[PDB]
């Protein structure tokens, strides 16, 4: 029932990454640190800072051995369109996963069942697929990227010093 | 069992229509001839001929009192963006309903359960909410708007001329 | 759930085809494009234009490797009589399948349960038995054979090609 | 669970009788003697001698207060066409009921499930809707209308002589 | 679920035939024509004309290769007694099957459930066990053996000479004259 | 599960009694002692000694207020025929119930399901419908009528003198 | 459904028989005529004439090759006490089976469910374990031992002579 | 699911008490303290010390308002016979309930299913029918009547009290 | 399925707050901002800073109108003992709820089913009972109190003016 | 239904014993006499007389080859704290098992479901893991340690002398 300290479930989703489409599965995450950054919808007026802030810290995340996977219930097709429309989103070098089925979102118990959109949840996952940190916020409340990085560092220190 | 000659089910969806966001329910379809034009996805590399062909026949559809509802599992936000970025979709003066939940799509039994996208379906609906014509096609196979237009005229004629 | 992109189910019906009584099954549709043209009843006062239009395009459909199967819940005996009586139905050189059991009609979820008659539904089926197009209409709303033929041409092109990627003409 | 000495179940079928379409129900049978003459199909290659043989005795049946209801799984539309087609079927003054649903045929346990056609069965039914005689035969074994008339007269004698 | 054109179901009953008792099963009906002649009860005040009619045609039936099995829910013991008591039944040289379980009567869907007696029914069966003719009547409505015998000869003709049924082709456009 | 000390269930059967057909129901057994004497079949080769033995003791049973009901799955029609044919069965002045439905036989859980014949069982029933004595035997094993009479006298004694225990004394 | 002409079911009960305790199973009944004499309870105020009557006929039952099994829901301990406490029960040389579980009683469909006691039922069982005679009575209605013996002789004669009446 | 702190279930059994036969129900336990003293069987070779030990404290138990109910799967008839045969059981002036149907034994989850006999269990019950103390022992492990009597006094002391808090 | 933006479920737990035992229910949280600070166990060799960190920021939380509810599967009796034992836990002015049934913990989907202890989860709740923020970490990975304060301020800002 | 004369279930619990944490399973009980002394909670105001009474008899329980396991739905961490906070509990040299899951408690059908605390039950278990004696009491009704010892001696005697005349 509690998702913390449990293994991520298998998936197969299409994504957009650096001007091309790819297929991403649980096989790709294993052996590496992973960040599943869920959010409600592309092309929303509200707050694209969240994705842009993570894009500003991406070279630090690559040095720390972390992959970022932005996820929403929109298709990989619209991620490509949104990546060309907005200069905040255009900075994103990491994968933007499309989840129209809601299967990846439902593996993390993160669906707004009334809206058909994912809640603003972030899941730090280790090389064995175990979820080490969770952070969820309501609509309008932002997640600051510096706090994410602190939990990544904190999880990595605990990984090598039990 | 078939959806032909059954009543449409209740729904509540957000939609984009002529530069403005609106909520559309089954109450809005009551008393109106309604075309529910389902399609898989916005921003695909497939040509937007199906939707553009309906847009070319929209003045003719307006003379028959027909409301067109383009439906996909994309958000109404994504519909606005597509309407701005595409030359063919910019012509659309009819409602583009967003269906992220899939509730509207599942009311017409029209989901691709593997993909989370609607199949290419067209449902002609009369003022009492009764489905008079159904047209479904596999991916790639387009549907003709003048054929849809012919089907609406026939449905209106049958309603107006009981028995022959 | 939709019948689109599903495999057709097995059947064994008797049919009238251009003088002979024959038996048709799902085996006969394998390796061939197929059209299952459901209609309500023989000897009604509704115009048979639908079945006559398909007969006019039957040369072209045969060259496209397409078999046509007109279906109703009447018997193959009744089809023969209607083929002799009606001047429009006399044109058809394709199979008129009889489905008094309603088994073939119920495979395509096309029964008017109250009437015991099939709804007005055309199904385009490919060589692997997969339904590529569906068209259903209420009483009095005809279907166009030119539209049907355009879809078959489209379905054959799409089967022979990958997903479409638009040029600069649209 | 034999049908003999059981009441006929309700029905509502379209029928053809002397150049017009009418609706027949169980309400139309009550008060009068009835013959439910089931047969396989219209427009068959097999002779309509059985149906014409009842037509030859129909004036005699009407003297005895006996209605004839010829039943089949074809529509009432095909009955009209077959009535104008065949000289033998043109003699039919009685109702030709259409049973495309098979409901009337199934009430008499008379459906060939493999073929969707009624078997060659004749039922004699009294004014209270009670089945007094049953006759079913295979394809090519004839039903003698003279034997049918004997059984009705026998049944009518028994009704008046407890 | 019509019984016509269906195979007869297996049975095992005790019967009386020509002053002795025998067991009869479905295997005894193989390769021969069979008449199953159901009736309500022995020792009733109703006319025994129906069993006598078949006994009068039994010499003719045996020449057509047709066995007769009279059946009721009475015992084979009771059948013997009635064969000694009544001169009409005393004529019967065919088997009188007892069916106190009702299993044979229920195989032919012929039981009066409220009475525990078989209805007045005649079933014609071919060498392959397939029911070719069914006749059922109420109390007092007779069955004449001449009509039965006609149907047997018709069933035998159709078996030996299939496709020689009356053609509707002496009528409508195409004719044979 | 046992039928002892349970009430007899409702029934309606046609019967033969002294050259006359009559209907017998549970209402006819009310307020009187009743013996239900089940047996397999009329016209059997087995000796009908059991029915003849009850016939001999029938006067005694009538003086004790006891009605006897012979039961089998044969019809009342065959009971009449068996009554005139057999010398032993001609002595029967009591009711011979027919049970071709098997309903009365199954109320006493006494049907040989594979034969469609009742087992050879005797049930003693009091004025209130309560079964006071059961006796069931296999084929060949005979039931004694003088033992049946002793059981009825004991049942009638216990009904009249309940709360009776064993005595003891001397001197 | 009738229990006549059905095979007895397996059981395992402790029993009292002539000064000592023994275990009785269905295997001990194989190949022999058996009488299962069920009764309600030990130490009741009703006369034990039933059991005593069977004890009086025991020499004749041994001649016929019959095992008598007196059965109640009391324990074999209670059977021992009753055997030394009553003159009529002290005559009993046959096995007194205890059935506190009620499994033996329920195998013969003979339990008074609201009392937890067996009904007054006698079952005659042949060498193949098949029940050939049943007899049940209410309280106060005695079972005759001469009648029981007559039925055993009839059962043995029919077993040995198939067909003849 | 422990039986502790649960209300006793309805029952209707016959019993031997001091020469008389009587009927005992759950109605008879209302408004009084009760001891249900289960045991396996009458007339066994096992010493009946447990029942005689409780009989010696019965005078003290009655002054405390405590009824004793010895229970086994044997009949009330068998209790009467056992009462006369043994000198130890002759001391018992409390009710000896028979439970041949086994319902009262099964109400306290105390049946040896494959033997058809009750286990060696003691259940102390208060005036509201709530079970305050349970004791179960295997074969040949005796129960102390003095220990039972201590628990009753404690249960009566605590009955008229809230949560205990130690003085030190 | 997601707990975020859902109402808190009813509860009734015994708590220890400033030297007295009090019963806390959902009705006590109604009309006020609430923080449900879950943790594994009392008397652990693990860092007790997490509880003391919140106690150091408690004056600032009281100005913002925030009630803190520390929750574990230990008894309220145990919380009292731990409040007397450790000088770090002695600083705690706020209510320490005991949850031996696991009912309150299972309302927030926060039970380690194999351990019978609550995970290190923090739930910010508004006056209407709606969960506005969630934070869960594994064993060893701490939660800083300054981030909790920012999420409360951000949640309050969004409540005052949504736009 | 009855838990008497049944084998104990497998378990895995953390425990405190003489300033040291250890794991205890059913493997540790195999081949030994075991007393499972359940109780509701640590740091309650109720007197700890029960546990202190068993502590006074632990030396002779150890001579008899008997292990004592105090069990509660508290943690092994709280047991350490409670051992250093109370003079009565400080006497305990036997294992104090923590059962926060309630699994061990539920194996003995001893959970107060509405409270989440074990009932006041004592289970004597032989070297084959078979439950020979059960004692459950309501709150306030104390369990006597000398009676427990008297039962253990009887249980050991019956094991060493199977079957008896008297």
Residue numbers in the entry:
A (entry chain D), D (entry chain I): 1 to 162
B (entry chain E): 1 to 164
C (entry chain J): 1 to 170
E (entry chain H): 1 to 177
F (entry chain G): 1 to 171
G (entry chain F): 1 to 165
H (entry chain A): 1 to 168
I (entry chain C): 1 to 163
Quote the study on this structure.
The Prx subfamily enzyme Prx1, also typically called 2-Cys Prx, is among the most highly expressed, soluble proteins in the cell, and is characterized by two conserved cysteine residues. We used the mechanistically well understood E. coli as a prototype to construct a chimeric Prx, EcAhpC1-186-YFSKHN, composed of EcAhpC (residues 1–186) and the C-terminal YFSKHN-segment of human Prx 2, to be compared with wild-type (WT) EcAhpC. The chimeric EcAhpC1-186-YFSKHN described here demonstrates, that transformation of the human C-terminal YFSKHN-helix into the related bacterial AhpC confers sensitivity to over-oxidation on the chimeric enzyme. Structural details of the oxidized and reduced chimeric EcAhpC1-186-YFSKHN provide novel insights into sub-steps during the catalysis of peroxide reduction, enabling the transition from a fully folded to a locally unfolded conformation. Together with mutational and enzymatic studies these data unravel the fundamental role of the C-terminal tail as a molecular switch that mediates the structural transition between the FF and LU state during the catalytic cycle.
To understand the structural effect of the human YFSKHN-helix in general, in particular inside the chimeric EcAhpC1-186-YFSKHN, as well as to identify the individual amino acids essential for sensitivity to oxidative inactivation of Prxs, the crystal structure of oxidized EcAhpC1-186-YFSKHN has been solved at 2.7 Å resolution. The asymmetric unit contains one decamer composed of five catalytic dimers (α2)5 with each subunit containing one catalytic active peroxidatic and one resolving cysteine. The intermolecular disulphide bond observed between CP47 and CR166′ in the dimer interface confirms the oxidized state of the EcAhpC1-186-YFSKHN structure. The peroxidatic cysteine (CP47), located in the first turn of helix α2, adopts an LU conformation in the oxidized structure. In most of the disulphide bonded active sites of the decameric and oxidized EcAhpC1-186-YFSKHN, the C-terminal arm beyond the resolving cysteine (CR166) is disordered, indicating the high flexibility of the C-terminus. However, the structure in chain (H) could be resolved until residue 177, showing amino acids 167 to 177 oriented away from the active site and stacked against the neighboring symmetry molecule. Similarly, the C-termini of chains A, G and J are also stabilized by the packing interactions with the symmetry related molecules. The average main chain B-factors analysis revealed three dynamic regions of oxidized EcAhpC1-186-YFSKHN: (i) the CP47 containing α2-helix, (ii) helix α5 that contains residues S86 and T88, and (iii) the C-terminal tail region. The sulfate ions observed in the interface region of the structure, emphasis their role in stabilizing the oxidized AhpC in a decameric form in solution. Superposition of the recently resolved oxidized EcAhpC structure with the corresponding dimer of the oxidized EcAhpC1-186-YFSKHN one resulted in an r.m.s.d. value of 0.4 Å.
